[PDB]
Design a protein around this ligand. Structure first.
Ligand SMILES: CC(C)c1nc(CN(C)C(=O)N[C@H](C(=O)N[C@@H](Cc2ccccc2)C[C@H](O)[C@H](Cc2ccccc2)NC(=O)OCc2cncs2)C(C)C)cs1
Lengths: 99, 99
């Protein structure tokens, strides 16, 4: 579907049996969620943002449904104020920018 | 044109007679530049993001050229690690997300 930018580009996604809304963020290399429960092993990691850096957990090969699209990738879990779908996953649903 | 997301979506801009590269950021409501010199008055403002918040100057009605597209809008200047073009200007050039 095509989405204009008069409003924040929110998408509904399913991950680990949980439902959430996330922002399609072309300005984000990675995908991060605020508190969700994911299983298994992860690794420590720090993300750099506009206001500074945050410490997150890094999970790989995590199944994720973005607008009905099934894909798998690396998902970070950390203290973000907004759930974000990054380029690492937007690339997987074929999402592009147009103008 | 069309822009896939395998690489950060950078565009070349001209603003205040100065050249810069910026990220087409669908996850940003506003446009922010680190160190550029803009004329005129401005109003202090704070912006939030991953990592915390930062104090920035808010200039309105600033002529800016984005990939050859001449438009005008609010531009923030402040301690940001990367130049960002927000939704406030992306809508001006008719930029959309597609998948
Ligand atoms: C619900 C409430 C919390 C919300 N507020 C907002 C409005 N806000 C603050 C913003 O749009 N804020 C923008 C912003 O930082 N956006 C950010 C996402 C975000 C949104 C909301 C809250 C926190 C983070 C997203 C931006 O693309 C920044 C740009 C950037 C790139 C390189 C270096 C520094 C910065 N990119 C990143 O932070 O990349 C790192 C990563 C971000 N997410 C996963 S990895 C500013 C640039 C204007 C949206 S949702």
């Amino acid at each position: 579907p095509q989405i204009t930018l008069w409003q924040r580009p929110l998408v509904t996604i399913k991950i680990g049996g949980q439902l959430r809304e996330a922002l399609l963020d072309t300005g984000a290399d990675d995908t991060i969620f605020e508190e969700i429960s994911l299983p298994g092993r992860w690794k420590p990691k720090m993300i750099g943002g506009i206001g500074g850096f945050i410490k997150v957990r890094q999970y790989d090969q995590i199944p994720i449904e973005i607008c009905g699209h099934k894909v798998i990738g690396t998902v970070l879990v950390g203290p973000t104020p907004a759930n974000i779908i990054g380029r690492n996953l937007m690339t997987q649903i074929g999402c592009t920018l147009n103008f």
